[PDB]
Amino acid sequence: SPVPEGVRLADGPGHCKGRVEVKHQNQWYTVCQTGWSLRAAKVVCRQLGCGRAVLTQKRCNKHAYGRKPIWLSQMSCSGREATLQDCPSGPWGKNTCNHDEDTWVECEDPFDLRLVGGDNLCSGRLEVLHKGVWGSVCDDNWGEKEDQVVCKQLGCGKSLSPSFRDRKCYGPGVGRIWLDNVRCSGEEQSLEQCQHRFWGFHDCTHQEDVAVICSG
Amino acid sequence: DERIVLVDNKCKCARITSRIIRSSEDPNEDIVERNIRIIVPLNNRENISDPTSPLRTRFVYHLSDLCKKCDPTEVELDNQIVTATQSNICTETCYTYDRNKCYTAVVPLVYGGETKMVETALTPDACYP
Amino acid sequence: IRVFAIPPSFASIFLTKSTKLTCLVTDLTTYDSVTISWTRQNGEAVKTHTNISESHPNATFSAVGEASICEDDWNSGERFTCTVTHTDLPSPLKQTISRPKGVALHRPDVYLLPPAREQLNLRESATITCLVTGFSPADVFVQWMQRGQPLSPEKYVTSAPMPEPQAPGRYFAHSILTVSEEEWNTGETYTCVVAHEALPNRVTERTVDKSTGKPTLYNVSLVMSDTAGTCY
Amino acid sequence: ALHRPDVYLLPPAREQLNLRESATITCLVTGFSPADVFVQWMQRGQPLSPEKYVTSAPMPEPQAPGRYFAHSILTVSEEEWNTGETYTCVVAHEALPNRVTERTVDKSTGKPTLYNVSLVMS
Amino acid sequence: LHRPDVYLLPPAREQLNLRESATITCLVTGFSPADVFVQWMQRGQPLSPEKYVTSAPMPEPQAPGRYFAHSILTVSEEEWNTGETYTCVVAHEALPNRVTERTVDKSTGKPTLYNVSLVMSDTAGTCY
Amino acid sequence: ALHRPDVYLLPPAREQLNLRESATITCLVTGFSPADVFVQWMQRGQPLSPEKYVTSAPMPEPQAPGRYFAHSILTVSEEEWNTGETYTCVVAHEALPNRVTERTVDKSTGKPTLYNVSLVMSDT
Ligand SMILES: *[C@@H]1O[C@H](CO)[C@@H](O[C@@H]2O[C@H](CO)[C@@H](O)[C@H](O)[C@H]2NC(C)=O)[C@H](O)[C@H]1NC(C)=O
Ligand SMILES: [Ca+2]
Ligand SMILES: [Ca+2]
């Protein structure tokens, strides 16, 4: 049986949304396996690295030009397993695609962060990308532990504890306060891996923002 | 370690903890305890952002509006991810000040005739500009 | 011969994300000469999916036939009908289905009732109750969870909506979950997820636990000071 | 195999009363066989009208085969519930000794509480 | 740079008995250097430069390098008995926002009695 | 002419004592003429060094012409003050009949009389 070389998610806005297109040896075709739970969508999203699977559904075919043939094996995958290579597949046989429907999948935008307002980077206001928008992080709880996690992710070195005397050189923000009550205990790898309140809910003002100055 | 914090309000300085004590040995005869700790200010006034407001000598503490959850949570349904409303009940008065917050005011300053309004710090230290 | 055609409720639409139509046929003799057909309002044919189940004690056969049409056509108000032909029946049967229109939307309330005190003294089992009420129309989906993982369906039973005697145009339903007594005394947590069309976010959640219930003691403490004008 | 059913009453939800519209009284009866049960609602020894409660239907218990169960709910006014009126859920089953069993709850139904109030003056 | 501290002392109890006038003092201490600017107000109305006096800063014998000064304001006995409010405003470089203010009246600052009322309802509500 | 000075002693502020650092007292002498005033301090009947209190020169009073006023400031450790000691201010002027007048302040100066408190518990 063919081994998937990759997934591309064509016919969708960007490459984190669209129709599931398994790369068959040489020419590739669309797949409509039954029991398409979110577990397989999570592995599909992890193939591209977009982020977390949010939704999967099969859409009615009304002159959608589904020229791509269909596969002949199932892909029962536990979701916590590795790439599509390491999940069992049926021994060829017939297809489970009775109703002619395309499989849809909706991944999420990847995370990103930066410092704005500081010279030669490694300093300034904190902006985090989510839902395709940048925003500020509240300073209600900003311990020294929460400062070093941001610094190493951008490779700016250990923070030098600049206090608030030089934190007035960046000013306030205008964007939405995405994060609040951030509590980072361990190093982890990303700020999103910490415990926060929620995306979009806060009790802060643009005057109270977070400024992080690393070594550089 | 044996107590779990339910609410940690700062405006009303209210804190509620619950704990189960293994009294006797029958599992059906263990008491459930609810502790409430309230600190009331005797010098703060009606409006904490206006020094001219009169003094406050009446405090009301509703426990139904204190132990309330108002933040959508994520729920997995094996086919999608949705946001769920915790409560349907969701202008509250702040009795005391908050350390994590800054309180400022506008005051007229006269000198040589000209009047320059300047931002003040009602709180002793709080945060810095 | 009896033919039942159930429409797809919004509860199925929420989870399956697919609108399918089923025409249950009961008391069938010859399954080699039957045809489950689905047609539109003009006469166009729709591709069907007929599956024959196993045998029955009363020497009858059950026919299950799915027809799939996406929600854009169905929610617009178009009418469908089911036809079952049999060589023993001189005339094919006609059963039509469609979704009603013109009903107001009222937000439902969620109530969780802890187990009775007189039940846990037997050291046998407990019973938690999830109550949803005052909603229109009569469509509701209730599912129980524990630690973020769905429970086995058998552990709980959900009933059909029933009218409310004291308020016209409003309904209610119930859900019952059974758990061990030692599990409840340990302090595990449970969750009742309820979905209805009239909700602001379409999904609501409540949680019950032994610790956060009715407390025997209320150790209230009040401290008065003339200098503590701020709280961290 | 005739079995004696067990009747359990549920006191109304406190938040429902807090919002001050009505109250919900549940009569949960399980563990009877065969499927033959009749529940009624009486107040102060006087049976209420059939239009006051809604009666469920027998349906098998998935956990223990051969057992059926149902329930009945009666809505009461908030002022009527607060005034101290009593309610009961009389049940009838052939397997019962006297064919009549009763469970009764009230507002006072519960466990006595305590209040360890402390008023610190400094 | 040292942040100064401000305290107000209410008029003496045995001064009001004569029913002549009341005196309020604004003590600012612990600052360097020795240039301060104190202005009195009455419920948002700046007061005249003549009703209050101020003293030049003097060294503190206890801690060298920190100074102090005070401003004295007089008021009518009936005006203070009515319950009017007064404010003390000090300007110095050491402050974060560079200006601070404090407020005193009859009910606050060495009062006669304390009247408190407390209500605690919905003590058996839903917590979850 | 001559006039009788009046002596007022003011206790330390509550907010300063809450910081548990130090306490200060004030001895206000006013309504007197001419400018010749000699003020000391005492503690349990014995005098203290002149390095622990500071006095000011007379300044004309804008309100009543021909009247002067002066002030003295003394520093006290909050813990000592909280022990319960007594402090005395002595003012010496030529217009007073006996040339000497004294005032005393304690920790208990300004303690309130009534603490009316009521509590309501409505389990509604
Ligand atoms: C308590 O004081 C605040 C501050 O004065 C009041 O809110 C301010 O109202 C003025 C106009 O009257 C605005 O210029 C300010 O922007 C407001 N403050 C804020 C933070 O927005 C408030 O109304 C007062 N409360 C009461 C009950 O009088
Ligand atoms: Ca802050
Ligand atoms: Ca916060």
Numbering used by the authors:
A (entry chain N): 132 to 347
B (entry chain J): 2 to 91, 97 to 135
C (entry chain L): 345 to 576
D (entry chain K): 448 to 569
E (entry chain A): 449 to 576
F (entry chain B): 448 to 571
Please share text taken word for word from the publication where this structure appeared.
Apoptosis inhibitor of macrophage (AIM/CD5L) is a soluble protein belonging to the scavenger receptor cysteine-rich (SRCR) superfamily that contributes to prevention of a wide range of diseases associated with infection, inflammation, and cancer. AIM forms complexes with IgM pentamers which helps maintain high-levels of circulating AIM in serum for subsequent activation on release from the complex. Here we apply cryogenic electron microscopy imaging (cryo-EM) to show how interfaces on both of AIM’s C-terminal SRCR domains interact with the Fcμ constant region and J chain components of the IgM core. The human Fcμ/J/AIM complex shows the binding of tandem AIM SRCR domains to IgM leading to sequestration and stabilisation of AIM.
AIM recognises IgM at both Fcμ and J chain. The total buried surface area (BSA) between AIM and IgM is 994 Å2, with 652 Å2 between AIM and J chain and 342 Å2 between AIM and subunit Fcμ5. The unpaired cysteine residue C191 in SRCR2AIM forms a disulfide bond with C414 in Cμ3-5B, which aligns with the fact that AIM does not dissociate from IgM during SDS–polyacrylamide gel electrophoresis in non-reducing conditions. This disulfide bond is crucial, as the C191S mutant completely abolished the binding between IgM and AIM, as previously shown. In addition, K173 and R183 in SRCR2 form two salt bridges with β-hairpin 2 of J chain at E77 and E75. SRCR3AIM sits between β-hairpin 2 and β-hairpin 3 of J chain and interacts with both loops. F329 and F332 on SRCR3 pack against P96 in β-hairpin 2 of J chain through a van der Waals contact, plus a salt bridge between D72 and R328.
